[PDB]
Coordinates of C-alpha atoms in Angstrom, one line a residue:
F152 CA 72.6 -65.7 21.5
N153 CA 71.8 -62.6 21.8
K154 CA 70.8 -59.9 19.4
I155 CA 74.2 -57.6 20.3
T156 CA 76.1 -61.0 20.8
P157 CA 78.1 -60.2 16.9
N158 CA 78.7 -57.1 17.8
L159 CA 80.3 -57.5 21.1
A160 CA 82.5 -60.2 19.2
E161 CA 83.4 -57.4 16.5
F162 CA 84.4 -55.3 19.4
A163 CA 87.2 -57.9 21.4
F164 CA 88.3 -58.4 17.8
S165 CA 89.2 -55.0 17.1
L166 CA 90.3 -54.5 20.5
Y167 CA 91.9 -57.2 20.4
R168 CA 94.3 -56.7 17.5
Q169 CA 95.0 -53.3 18.3
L170 CA 96.6 -54.4 21.2
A171 CA 98.2 -57.0 19.8
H172 CA 99.5 -54.7 17.6
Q173 CA 101.1 -51.8 20.1
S174 CA 103.7 -54.9 20.5
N175 CA 103.5 -58.7 21.0
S176 CA 106.4 -58.9 23.8
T177 CA 103.6 -58.3 26.6
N178 CA 100.6 -60.9 27.8
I179 CA 97.0 -59.4 26.7
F180 CA 94.1 -60.1 29.0
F181 CA 90.7 -57.8 28.7
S182 CA 87.0 -58.1 28.9
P183 CA 85.6 -57.3 25.7
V184 CA 82.0 -57.5 27.5
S185 CA 82.8 -55.2 31.2
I186 CA 84.3 -52.3 29.1
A187 CA 81.2 -52.4 26.6
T188 CA 78.3 -51.9 29.1
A189 CA 80.5 -49.3 31.3
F190 CA 80.6 -47.5 27.7
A191 CA 77.0 -48.1 26.3
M192 CA 75.8 -47.4 30.2
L193 CA 77.9 -44.1 29.4
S194 CA 76.3 -43.0 25.9
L195 CA 72.9 -42.7 28.1
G196 CA 74.8 -39.7 29.1
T197 CA 75.4 -38.5 26.0
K198 CA 74.1 -36.8 23.0
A199 CA 74.6 -36.4 18.8
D200 CA 78.4 -37.0 17.6
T201 CA 79.8 -37.9 20.9
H202 CA 76.7 -40.5 21.7
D203 CA 77.1 -42.1 18.0
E204 CA 80.7 -42.2 18.6
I205 CA 80.8 -44.2 21.5
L206 CA 78.1 -46.9 19.8
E207 CA 80.0 -47.2 16.1
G208 CA 83.5 -47.9 18.4
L209 CA 81.6 -50.2 20.1
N210 CA 80.5 -52.0 16.4
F211 CA 77.0 -51.1 15.9
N212 CA 75.9 -50.1 13.0
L213 CA 73.2 -47.1 14.0
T214 CA 71.6 -47.5 10.7
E215 CA 71.2 -51.3 11.0
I216 CA 70.4 -51.6 14.4
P217 CA 68.2 -49.5 17.0
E218 CA 69.4 -48.4 20.1
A219 CA 66.5 -49.7 22.1
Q220 CA 67.8 -53.3 20.7
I221 CA 71.4 -52.0 22.2
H222 CA 70.3 -51.7 25.2
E223 CA 68.0 -54.4 25.8
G224 CA 70.9 -56.4 24.5
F225 CA 73.2 -55.2 27.6
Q226 CA 69.9 -55.5 29.7
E227 CA 69.4 -58.8 29.1
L228 CA 73.5 -59.4 29.4
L229 CA 73.2 -58.4 32.7
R230 CA 70.7 -59.7 34.2
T231 CA 72.5 -62.8 33.3
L232 CA 76.0 -62.4 34.0
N233 CA 74.1 -61.7 38.4
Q234 CA 71.6 -63.9 39.1
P235 CA 71.2 -65.2 43.0
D236 CA 71.4 -69.0 43.1
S237 CA 73.6 -69.2 40.7
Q238 CA 77.4 -67.9 40.6
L239 CA 80.1 -68.1 37.6
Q240 CA 82.2 -65.9 40.7
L241 CA 82.4 -62.9 38.6
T242 CA 83.7 -60.0 40.9
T243 CA 83.4 -57.1 38.8
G244 CA 82.6 -53.1 39.4
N245 CA 82.2 -49.8 37.4
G246 CA 83.0 -46.5 39.1
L247 CA 81.2 -43.1 37.8
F248 CA 83.3 -40.1 39.5
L249 CA 81.7 -37.0 39.2
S250 CA 83.1 -33.5 40.6
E251 CA 81.2 -32.1 43.6
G252 CA 79.4 -28.7 42.8
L253 CA 78.6 -30.1 39.5
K254 CA 74.6 -30.2 39.2
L255 CA 74.1 -33.8 38.1
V256 CA 71.0 -34.6 36.0
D257 CA 68.7 -37.1 37.5
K258 CA 67.4 -39.9 34.6
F259 CA 70.9 -40.5 34.5
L260 CA 72.2 -41.5 37.5
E261 CA 68.9 -43.5 37.5
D262 CA 69.9 -45.1 34.1
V263 CA 73.4 -46.2 35.8
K264 CA 72.0 -47.5 39.4
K265 CA 69.1 -49.1 38.4
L266 CA 69.6 -50.8 34.1
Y267 CA 73.5 -50.7 34.6
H268 CA 73.2 -51.5 38.2
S269 CA 76.3 -48.8 38.4
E270 CA 78.0 -47.0 40.6
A271 CA 78.1 -43.1 40.5
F272 CA 80.0 -41.4 43.0
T273 CA 81.0 -37.2 43.7
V274 CA 84.1 -36.1 44.4
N275 CA 86.2 -33.5 45.4
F276 CA 88.6 -33.2 42.5
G277 CA 90.1 -29.8 43.9
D278 CA 92.0 -32.8 46.2
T279 CA 93.4 -34.7 43.7
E280 CA 95.4 -36.7 45.9
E281 CA 92.0 -37.3 48.2
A282 CA 90.7 -37.9 44.8
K283 CA 93.1 -40.6 44.1
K284 CA 92.3 -42.2 47.0
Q285 CA 89.0 -42.4 47.2
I286 CA 89.0 -43.7 43.8
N287 CA 91.4 -46.5 44.5
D288 CA 89.7 -47.5 47.5
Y289 CA 86.5 -47.9 45.8
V290 CA 88.6 -50.7 43.4
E291 CA 90.3 -51.8 46.3
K292 CA 87.4 -52.9 48.3
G293 CA 85.1 -54.3 45.4
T294 CA 88.1 -56.8 44.5
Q295 CA 88.5 -57.4 48.6
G296 CA 92.1 -56.3 47.9
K297 CA 93.0 -58.1 44.8
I298 CA 93.3 -54.3 43.0
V299 CA 94.8 -51.8 44.6
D300 CA 96.4 -48.9 43.8
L301 CA 95.3 -48.7 40.2
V302 CA 95.0 -44.8 39.2
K303 CA 98.6 -43.8 39.6
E304 CA 97.4 -40.2 38.2
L305 CA 94.9 -37.2 37.7
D306 CA 94.9 -34.5 35.0
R307 CA 95.1 -31.5 36.7
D308 CA 91.4 -30.5 35.5
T309 CA 89.3 -34.0 36.2
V310 CA 86.3 -33.4 37.0
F311 CA 85.1 -36.6 35.4
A312 CA 86.6 -40.4 35.6
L313 CA 85.4 -44.0 35.1
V314 CA 87.0 -46.4 36.6
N315 CA 86.1 -50.5 35.3
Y316 CA 87.4 -53.2 36.9
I317 CA 87.0 -57.5 36.5
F318 CA 88.7 -60.3 38.9
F319 CA 88.1 -63.7 37.3
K320 CA 89.4 -66.7 38.8
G321 CA 86.6 -69.9 38.2
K322 CA 86.4 -73.2 38.9
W323 CA 87.0 -76.2 36.5
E324 CA 83.7 -78.5 35.8
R325 CA 86.4 -81.4 35.3
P326 CA 89.3 -80.2 37.5
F327 CA 93.2 -81.0 37.1
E328 CA 94.9 -82.5 40.6
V329 CA 97.3 -80.6 41.9
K330 CA 99.8 -83.9 43.1
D331 CA 100.2 -83.9 39.0
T332 CA 101.0 -80.0 38.7
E333 CA 105.2 -79.9 38.1
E334 CA 107.6 -77.5 36.9
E335 CA 108.1 -77.1 32.7
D336 CA 109.6 -75.7 30.3
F337 CA 107.4 -73.0 28.5
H338 CA 108.9 -71.6 25.2
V339 CA 108.9 -68.3 24.6
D340 CA 111.1 -68.2 21.3
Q341 CA 111.8 -71.3 19.4
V342 CA 115.4 -71.4 21.1
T343 CA 114.7 -69.9 24.3
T344 CA 112.6 -71.6 27.6
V345 CA 111.7 -70.5 31.1
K346 CA 110.1 -72.3 33.5
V347 CA 106.5 -72.3 35.1
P348 CA 104.3 -74.6 37.4
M349 CA 102.6 -76.4 34.8
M350 CA 98.9 -78.4 35.2
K351 CA 98.5 -81.7 33.4
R352 CA 95.5 -84.5 32.9
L353 CA 95.1 -87.2 31.2
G354 CA 91.3 -87.2 29.8
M355 CA 88.9 -87.2 27.7
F356 CA 88.7 -83.2 26.6
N357 CA 87.2 -81.5 23.8
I358 CA 90.1 -80.8 21.7
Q359 CA 91.2 -80.9 18.6
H360 CA 93.5 -79.4 15.9
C361 CA 92.2 -77.3 13.0
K362 CA 93.6 -77.0 10.1
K363 CA 92.4 -73.6 9.0
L364 CA 93.2 -71.7 12.2
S365 CA 97.0 -73.7 12.4
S366 CA 96.5 -74.7 15.7
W367 CA 95.1 -76.9 18.2
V368 CA 91.9 -75.7 20.0
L369 CA 90.2 -76.7 23.8
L370 CA 87.1 -75.9 24.9
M371 CA 86.8 -76.4 28.8
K372 CA 83.8 -74.9 31.2
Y373 CA 83.5 -73.8 34.4
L374 CA 81.1 -74.1 37.2
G375 CA 78.5 -71.9 36.1
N376 CA 77.7 -70.5 32.2
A377 CA 80.8 -70.1 31.3
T378 CA 83.1 -71.4 28.9
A379 CA 87.1 -71.4 28.2
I380 CA 88.8 -71.8 25.0
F381 CA 92.3 -72.3 24.0
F382 CA 94.0 -71.7 21.0
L383 CA 97.5 -72.8 20.4
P384 CA 99.2 -72.3 17.0
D385 CA 101.4 -74.2 15.5
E386 CA 104.7 -73.7 14.9
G387 CA 105.2 -70.0 13.7
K388 CA 101.4 -69.4 13.6
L389 CA 100.0 -67.4 16.2
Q390 CA 100.0 -64.5 13.7
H391 CA 98.0 -66.2 11.3
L392 CA 95.9 -67.7 14.4
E393 CA 94.9 -64.2 15.8
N394 CA 94.1 -62.9 11.9
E395 CA 91.9 -65.6 11.1
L396 CA 89.7 -65.7 14.4
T397 CA 85.6 -64.8 13.3
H398 CA 82.9 -65.2 15.4
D399 CA 81.4 -67.7 13.1
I400 CA 84.9 -70.1 13.3
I401 CA 83.7 -69.5 17.7
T402 CA 80.3 -70.5 17.4
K403 CA 81.1 -73.5 15.5
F404 CA 83.4 -74.5 18.4
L405 CA 81.2 -74.2 20.9
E406 CA 78.4 -76.0 19.3
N407 CA 80.7 -79.2 19.3
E408 CA 80.8 -81.5 22.0
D409 CA 82.8 -84.5 20.8
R410 CA 85.6 -85.5 23.5
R411 CA 88.7 -87.8 22.4
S412 CA 91.9 -88.4 25.1
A413 CA 94.9 -86.4 25.2
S414 CA 97.8 -85.7 28.0
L415 CA 97.0 -81.9 28.5
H416 CA 99.5 -79.8 29.9
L417 CA 98.1 -76.9 31.1
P418 CA 99.9 -73.4 32.9
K419 CA 99.3 -72.7 36.2
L420 CA 99.0 -68.6 36.4
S421 CA 97.9 -65.2 37.1
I422 CA 98.3 -62.6 34.4
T423 CA 96.7 -58.9 34.1
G424 CA 95.7 -56.1 32.0
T425 CA 95.8 -52.9 32.7
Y426 CA 94.5 -50.3 30.0
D427 CA 93.9 -47.0 29.3
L428 CA 90.2 -46.7 27.5
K429 CA 90.7 -42.9 26.3
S430 CA 93.8 -43.9 24.6
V431 CA 92.6 -47.2 23.7
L432 CA 89.2 -46.7 22.9
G433 CA 91.0 -43.7 21.0
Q434 CA 92.2 -46.0 18.1
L435 CA 88.8 -47.5 17.5
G436 CA 87.0 -43.8 16.9
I437 CA 85.8 -43.1 20.7
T438 CA 87.4 -39.2 20.7
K439 CA 85.2 -37.1 21.4
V440 CA 83.7 -37.9 24.9
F441 CA 86.6 -37.3 26.2
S442 CA 87.9 -33.6 24.6
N443 CA 86.4 -30.3 25.4
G444 CA 83.6 -30.6 22.6
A445 CA 81.7 -33.5 24.8
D446 CA 78.3 -33.2 24.3
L447 CA 77.5 -34.9 27.9
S448 CA 74.7 -32.8 28.4
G449 CA 72.6 -36.0 29.7
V450 CA 74.9 -35.9 32.6
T451 CA 75.0 -32.5 33.6
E452 CA 72.6 -29.9 31.8
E453 CA 74.7 -26.1 32.3
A454 CA 78.3 -26.7 32.7
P455 CA 80.7 -28.2 30.0
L456 CA 82.0 -31.6 30.8
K457 CA 84.4 -34.4 29.5
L458 CA 86.0 -37.3 30.8
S459 CA 89.6 -37.4 31.9
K460 CA 90.0 -40.5 32.9
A461 CA 89.2 -43.7 32.2
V462 CA 90.8 -47.3 33.2
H463 CA 90.1 -50.8 32.7
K464 CA 91.8 -53.4 34.4
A465 CA 91.1 -57.3 34.3
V466 CA 93.0 -60.0 36.3
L467 CA 92.6 -63.8 35.4
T468 CA 93.6 -66.4 37.6
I469 CA 93.6 -70.0 36.6
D470 CA 94.9 -73.6 38.6
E471 CA 93.5 -76.8 39.3
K472 CA 90.7 -76.5 41.2
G473 CA 89.1 -72.9 41.3
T474 CA 88.5 -73.8 45.3
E475 CA 89.2 -76.1 48.5
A476 CA 85.5 -77.4 48.3
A477 CA 86.1 -80.8 46.6
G478 CA 83.9 -81.1 43.3
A479 CA 81.3 -83.9 42.7
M480 CA 83.0 -87.0 41.4
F481 CA 82.4 -88.3 38.1
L482 CA 84.7 -91.3 36.2
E483 CA 85.4 -90.3 32.3
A484 CA 86.2 -93.6 30.1
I485 CA 89.8 -93.5 28.8
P486 CA 90.6 -95.4 25.7
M487 CA 93.8 -97.7 25.4
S488 CA 95.1 -96.1 22.7
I489 CA 97.7 -93.5 23.0
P490 CA 97.0 -90.1 23.8
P491 CA 98.0 -87.0 21.9
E492 CA 100.4 -85.0 24.1
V493 CA 98.6 -81.3 23.8
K494 CA 101.3 -79.1 25.4
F495 CA 100.6 -75.3 26.3
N496 CA 104.2 -74.1 26.4
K497 CA 104.5 -71.3 24.1
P498 CA 102.6 -68.4 23.4
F499 CA 98.9 -68.9 22.8
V500 CA 95.5 -67.2 22.9
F501 CA 91.9 -67.4 24.5
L502 CA 88.6 -66.5 25.1
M503 CA 86.2 -66.9 28.1
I504 CA 82.7 -67.4 26.3
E505 CA 79.3 -66.8 28.8
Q506 CA 77.1 -69.9 27.7
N507 CA 73.7 -68.3 27.3
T508 CA 74.4 -65.0 25.2
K509 CA 77.5 -66.9 24.1
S510 CA 79.3 -62.8 24.7
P511 CA 82.9 -62.9 25.1
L512 CA 83.4 -62.0 28.8
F513 CA 87.7 -62.2 28.3
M514 CA 90.0 -62.5 25.6
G515 CA 93.9 -62.6 26.0
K516 CA 97.1 -63.8 24.7
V517 CA 99.4 -65.5 26.9
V518 CA 103.6 -64.7 26.1
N519 CA 104.6 -65.6 29.0
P520 CA 103.3 -67.0 32.0
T521 CA 105.8 -65.7 34.4
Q522 CA 106.0 -62.3 33.3
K523 CA 103.5 -60.0 35.7

């Protein structure tokens, strides 16, 4: 439900398939939305090919969609993700660190803080260790201690760095009971298991088995404007599941509101994803902004400039209840027939969607819960 939603979904997938390709034995978790928003904001300080590469690498076809529509699209998205009276409890931030002694262009600083409500700071890159400390302290402080020592090192000639972080710990509209959480096996291989805390509940879930995706598909809503979608592939269908996913298929799932009884087993976990955006977005065609040929004339008017560092960290916590604050009670009418046992006890894929815009807030893959 947003002009740029289709683009963000395409970006989420190209990014996902990129990461899934590098290796299939690691947990994947990232925010298509936080990354795309950061880079769209950055493009504002770039021009020509440098600029164009960035928007195209974010899956926007400049021959078909006007730039003004792109930014307004991100604007509406932001005005939604962070509103007063309503909170999905999303801790996110984007920090720009530019060399002191650089003559920055006002308009850029205005756009960053006013339009994309982001943060720009000036630091002394002459002192690498102190620069790193300030950057890391920024993240730590923004996540109240959940993300520490993010940046492990800086290039010798670093003059501009970008940090993008996001932490999500949502509250289910229909929570699990802690007393029902017990240790269960999780099949990493078809012949190997490992124990992990497993949440479980008998109720009416928006769950179904999809022939095309060869997977079970579960949708659960979070307090706020978000919805989690879990895809459990049949035996040997993970790769098929990954290839067959599409924005149209996901939109269809979100339209369905049918519920059926089931005994659901869902792992209680905490996973993280840390990526070097220069490397990852590089594989998506975004290379000039990170090179000596970078046209960042919208950032600094007279001196050479390029983005030498760009990091993204996404943290997800899934548990029985997002808070100790008991939620209002409700009663579901569960039939007396035998409910299917649907267990997320093997590699599965997931996506978190923002209900209004339908933007892909998060996307990931759990290969082994006890991996972190």
